[PDB]
Amino acid sequence: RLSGYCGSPWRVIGYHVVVWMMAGIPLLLFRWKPLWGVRLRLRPCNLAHAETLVIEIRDKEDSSWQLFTVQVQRVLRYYLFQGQRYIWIETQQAFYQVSLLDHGRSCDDVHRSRHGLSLQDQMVRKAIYGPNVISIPVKSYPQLLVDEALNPYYGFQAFSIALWLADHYYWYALCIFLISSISICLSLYKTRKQSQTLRDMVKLSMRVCVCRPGGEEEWVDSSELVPGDCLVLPQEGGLMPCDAALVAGECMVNESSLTGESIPVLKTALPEGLGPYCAETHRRHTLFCGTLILQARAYVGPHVLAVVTRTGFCTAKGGLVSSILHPRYKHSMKFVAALSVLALLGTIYSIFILYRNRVPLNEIVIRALDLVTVVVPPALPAAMTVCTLYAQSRLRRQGIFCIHPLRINLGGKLQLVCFDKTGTLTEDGLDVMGVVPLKGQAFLPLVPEPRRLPVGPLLRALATCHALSRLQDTPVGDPMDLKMVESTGWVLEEEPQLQAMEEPPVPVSVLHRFPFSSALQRMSVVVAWPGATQPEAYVKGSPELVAGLCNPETVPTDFAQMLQSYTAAGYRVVALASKPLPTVPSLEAAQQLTRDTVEGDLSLLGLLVMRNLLKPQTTPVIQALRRTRIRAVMVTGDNLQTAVTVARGCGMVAPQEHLIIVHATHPERGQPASLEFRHLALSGPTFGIIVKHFPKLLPKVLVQGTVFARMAPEQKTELVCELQKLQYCVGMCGDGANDCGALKAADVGISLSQAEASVVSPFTSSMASIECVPMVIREGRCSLDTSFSVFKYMALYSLTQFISVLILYTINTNLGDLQFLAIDLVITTTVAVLMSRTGPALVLGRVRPPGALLSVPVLSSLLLQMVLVTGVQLGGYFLTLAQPWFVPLNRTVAAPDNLPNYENTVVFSLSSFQYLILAAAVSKGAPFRRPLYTNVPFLVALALLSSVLVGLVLVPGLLQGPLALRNITDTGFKLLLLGLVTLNFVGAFMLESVLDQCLPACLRRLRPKRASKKRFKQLERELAEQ
Ligand SMILES: Nc1ncnc2c1ncn2[C@@H]1O[C@H](COP(=O)(O)OP(=O)(O)O)[C@@H](O)[C@H]1O
Ligand code: ALF
Ligand SMILES: [Mg+2]
């Protein structure tokens, strides 16, 4: 990602203001290519040292952004671009981001001193790094009102209002203005809600203290953190201002709003060692933003000291917020082109008819302008943007809590869902099943049974090698750690904070404890006890990792079968190693905090066999997702056999399963295809070594691959990117923190076991089940179907209104004043506002919704529907003209003063029901949405409208004076018109429920072949090599 920056300070006075004062009219039409405006308006020639208005050149992205270099102080010229600050350097003589003294600099030799930020001239660090606060720009009511009238739609509406006011019409203009004001207030309410859901999510202000060198303490506001500072963390509480680094002491934070887990993580102080310092590998030495310190009193002295790393919008939480709250079709163009073509043809026909009627030109332009300016139904942007709001409002009452609806339509076109293993498909609580010793009788099994029989170092290695921590009620931590501690018989009591109780043979004390990270799957600990000449060091982790990190003679040639037999049953077994820890290493390592040499000559002691059970609400959702031709793979980090037996516990798709056999270390890395005892399974290193050597077999294994075990936290993002590169819609459903970065690089992200709409992912659920992905998919498909139906209904309404105007303008006839208002408000707006009902059903569908709005079936449906409408219209016209009626008085009183007549009455009476008929004929679906008899408010509204409509075609005693209607004593109000409107109402349904069959599909299916999404031919070519 590269881009240039060129600008100029200012231009000389003169015509540079007149040019933009005169060329301001075509600004509404010059929205395309915005570089021309900034190039012709203000673009003088100057040097390259005093830029004030800088514009960027398009190199990789077609966009444009305007900036302003503010100067508060040297020069100190800087601007705000997407929240990131850019300063002007003197050495490189170019713009530089805020990345100095980091990512390759600020070594430990100058970072492990922390003099204390002596009282110098603090005027250069506040204007460069900015204030230590996350201020969200908010807008007031006039500020939000002045910038919303920039769209050309509002200008067209204002022009229509002016044209209606300049024609002695104060009724239609009033309703149009009311609808526009309703749309404006709805948009302002939506913007206010979208701003309030973010302003309340960020942290608030507090009162903290900043330490100074010596005996100086001040109570300043909670904004003083600058890169390279040192603050104090009293009260043993959380509420972290921004990112920081703990250099002295240990602490435990709660990264629940940054990772997605409520498990306490232990933070270790930064040790010595001259090397690079970056925020990519020291995940246990720094403190991120939004962390809650559980219990950390002091380690050396009165209290611990923390070092500030970064402040502003580039922190861990602020950067993620700015990156995930960043603002990111072709058939619509042809649709509006055809609509404009039909409109111009109709207006040409109308002007030809008017010229044939021998009418002077003074009355032709006023009608032509009105006809060309009235083509779009009111509340167009208010009806297409309210469906997402209604969906977001109705999803809150089910469990899904989204931060902002942006990718709702993407859920309806999903084809691959990734599921986790622990926390998603299985229960989080484990169960112990005994200890399998490996040191008894010269590396021999002792028939392990589930009991509590510790001999020798088994008590300390099982009761001390952990990361337990109590908060006034009980030790809380990892579930496996709790299950191991409770199955031992030891109680942790309050270094005095790491002591135990009930020690039969000898009391024990924990000197040092190393936490667990995502990079390495192990954890060391220092275990000492009075009565020995040297302590011991234990470590717990995966057997495959500790097998090549110990003595070559620790287990005979029986582990490859024992581990497989223990993992092929559904249990979870781990390995525990031990180190003799002689006097010299224990003395020279307890004062340096080393890790490369402490994990050397290890010795296995025993194995902990756990038990993981699946959730009883997993098989129905899995079957429902499998019976809808939707691929579902499992991406975990456990052993291969564990994932295999977990997948076999349900058995979705596994014909002739194949696995990659271990002990494959060929120089050419040639992995063959073996048998288990169509689909393949990939491991961590197995998938890692097939992406660099041979870059030609990746799309062949990724399709059939459904079991991804032993994965790495840094490899899941690469897999997601490789899956998305093939034009897919893969979505991961993770629970732990090992797959946090993969959710930020996918289309959809599940946030199970979260709350308050965590920022870790836009979609967030409030239940521990997998029944949220199908719900999201069906909600998205229902929203897409509703939007398509609304667009089709709007197009049909526009076309039928054009046809009505055309048939009304045959010689000289105009509709009523209040009739247009009653049609656009009661008949059109009321049914369009309440059209977002009838959500998704409880049964999914195998057929996928279409992604285009200009298909052959829908176009043929619209064409046949309009043919039927014009046919029934001409039939009604012939019927009302073939009756013994009176004679008109045209060509002598032609003026807007003879509104009550028999010309437009029957036309309006026949056209008013057309909208109500077409509204209930396009918004319906059996497998996508709910039937029409489910929503009660819309049903009673339609009933009230139908009653009001039928109340006028019989006994015309009222609602005729102000409405400009007349009375008739003929059979017009009788079945003569009722039998016709009912016939049309039935014919519309009969014609709409016939083309929805698979006839057009099978007619347009046998003609073409598989190309342009030739996925079928791709699968055929893939299977052709078998
Ligand atoms: N008590 C423990 N102490 C240290 N490491 C452990 C412990 N339990 C599991 N591990 C490590 O975790 C890895 C598997 O993690 P996994 O279950 O995939 O995490 P997640 O379920 O969050 O994806 C194993 O390689 C193992 O080394
Ligand atoms: F099984 Al997991 F994150 F819980 F891979
Ligand atoms: Mg998880």
Author numbering: 36 to 108, 161 to 415, 422 to 587, 609 to 791, 821 to 1169
Paper passage:
Adenine nucleotides (AMP-PCP or ADP) or phosphate analogs (BeF3− or AlF4−) were used to stabilize hATP13A2 in the E1-ATP or E1P/E2P intermediate states. Then, in the following E1P-ADP–to–E2P transition, ADP release from the catalytic center would induce the outward movement of the N-domain by ~25°, which would subsequently alter the architecture of the TM regions, causing entrance pocket Site1 to open toward the luminal side of the lysosome and allowing the recruitment of a polyamine, after which the polyamine would move deeper into Site1 in the subsequent E2-Pi state. Four intermediate states (including E1-ATP, E1P-ADP, E2P, and E2-Pi) were solved at relatively high resolutions (3.2–3.7 Å), whereas the E1-like and putative E2 states were solved at medium resolutions (5.6 Å and 4.8 Å, respectively) probably due to the rapid dynamic equilibrium between the E1 and E2 states.
ATP13A2, which is mutated in juvenile-onset Parkinson’s disease and autosomal recessive spastic paraplegia 78, is a transporter with a critical role in balancing the polyamine concentration between the lysosome and the cytosol. The overall structure of hATP13A2 has a canonical P-type ATPase architecture, with the cytosolic A domain linking to TM1 and TM2 domains, and the N and P domains sitting on the TM4 and TM5. The P-type ATPases transport substrates by coupling ATP hydrolysis with protein phosphorylation states and adopting a series of intermediate states, consisting of E1, E1-ATP, E1P-ADP, E1P, E2P, E2-Pi, and E2, in a process known as the Post-Albers reaction. Here, we report seven cryo-EM structures of hATP13A2 in six intermediate states, importantly including the putative E2 and E1-like states, thereby providing a nearly complete atomic-level conformational cycle spanning the Post-Albers reaction process.
